[PDB]
């Protein structure tokens, strides 16, 4: 829900990490029109642990949204943005005609029509070299046989559905700094039940202990390497772990 995105040739891909990702607030920002999730599942993302999640923003045509998919080419798919076969990321798209369509036409969004070759996947090039097409040399000047490589969209509100701005956000997953929102529960009283304090899995009765843990430890072991004490990482309080009856 930013103010102004970039064009389709640029990425502006802001890497997000070092924090827990909650994949539930994106559904309360704007009504999306395309929620493809190549590689993963929309519901099954708050459980895996990833190392680096990238996120780019761009505006592309509505007729060509189906062309942004792994193993599929197009007009803007060989020179500006390519999805390889090892690309497993959700492609979220939503129309933005109410914010990126002025009556006099906007020419701020640019796209490339043809390069000298096909660009490699997972690569971004912002070269403004004027295209050299013909049998006569072009000395970096706009002439007859010399063409600019960048072309504008020209989005207008009078154009029908399909030629409108579509802000498509490519969320990627790469492979542990970003994890899912592990939800907690309520601490029960002294009863032999199951417990899991950040990996500490076992059975026993959680009773009020009298120990004094130093402010850098969580759990503790006995003389025989047996976990019988732990501190709840919710509110500072010691808890004894006696074996079940």
């Amino acid at each position, epitope marked *: 829900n930013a103010t102004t995105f970039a064009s389709v040739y640029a990425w502006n891909r802001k890497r997000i990490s070092n924090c827990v990702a909650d994949y539930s607030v994106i559904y309360n920002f704007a009504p999306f029109f395309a929620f493809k999730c190549y590689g993963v599942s929309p519901t099954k993302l708050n459980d895996l642990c990833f190392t680096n999640v990238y996120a780019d923003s761009f505006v592309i045509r509505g007729n060509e949204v189906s062309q942004i998919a792994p193993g599929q080419t197009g007009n803007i798919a060989d020179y500006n943005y390519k999805l390889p076969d090892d690309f497993t990321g959700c492609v979220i798209a939503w129309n933005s005609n109410k914010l990126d369509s002025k009556p006099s036409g906007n020419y701020n969004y640019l796209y490339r029509l*043809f390069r000298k070759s096909k660009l490699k996947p997972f690569e971004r090039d912002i070269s403004t070299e004027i295209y050299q097409a013909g049998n006569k040399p072009c000395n970096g000047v706009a002439g007859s046989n010399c063409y600019s490589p960048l072309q504008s969209y*020209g989005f207008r509100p009078t154009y029908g559905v399909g030629h409108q701005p579509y802000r498509v956000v490519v969320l990627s997953f790469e492979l542990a700094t970003v994890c899912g929102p592990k939800k907690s529960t309520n601490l029960v009283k002294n009863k032999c039940v199951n417990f899991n304090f950040n990996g500490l899995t076992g059975t026993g009765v959680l009773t009020e202990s009298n120990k004094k843990f130093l402010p850098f430890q969580q759990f503790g072991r006995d003389i025989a390497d047996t976990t019988d004490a732990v501190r709840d990482p919710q509110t500072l309080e010691i808890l004894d772990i006696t074996p079940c009856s």
Partner: single-chain antibody
Amino acid sequence: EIVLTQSPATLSLSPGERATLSCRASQSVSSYLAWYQQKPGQAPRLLIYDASNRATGIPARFSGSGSGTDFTLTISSLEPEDFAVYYCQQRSNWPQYTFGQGTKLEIKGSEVQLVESGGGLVKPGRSLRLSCTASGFTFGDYAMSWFRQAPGKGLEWVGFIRSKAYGGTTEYAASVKGRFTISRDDSKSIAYLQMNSLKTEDTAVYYCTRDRYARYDILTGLSPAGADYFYYAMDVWGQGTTVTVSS
């Protein structure tokens, strides 16, 4: 600033001999010369664009050579219907299409089609607005350019609007700045041209032709040596209206 002048003025060479066409220029222009052959009354017809390859439609009696500050075109055939003025146009400066005083030679002494509108009396109600609707190429993928032809003065430049792809900017000449504003309506396959503040000297015959094809993906695969480059990326002249001035 590049002045293109022709050396011959009135060649009365009878059909069945040779014919030469020399064109010089002050600034050293590259292979960007366009040769027009215009019948009196009809629309101009280009012969050899960029001085490198020929057009489509004219016979093979146009063998020439040359490059730089001089061009040549030796016609070693007769003159069956050579009653037309041989002009020259440069293609180097894009917003500065400049023509020259062609030479008048005499005998002795197709889905591309477009129509225009806008003309008549100009002094009462000094507001004329020409229109340009085409029915050939897909109107919209090509920039819209204009050229006026004054009676007994030669071909002249007016202005243009670039196509929808390469921005919606504009560029005019020095004598049409602040007076000639071109508006495009590619949604309806129409291009307009406002001519407010009209004078007595602006009574020429304007023509709307094609300009650069902003789509260049196809132009790299096909080499400009046949009719393909003439069919996809090529400008063609059309019909024009008349402007009448009085007191």
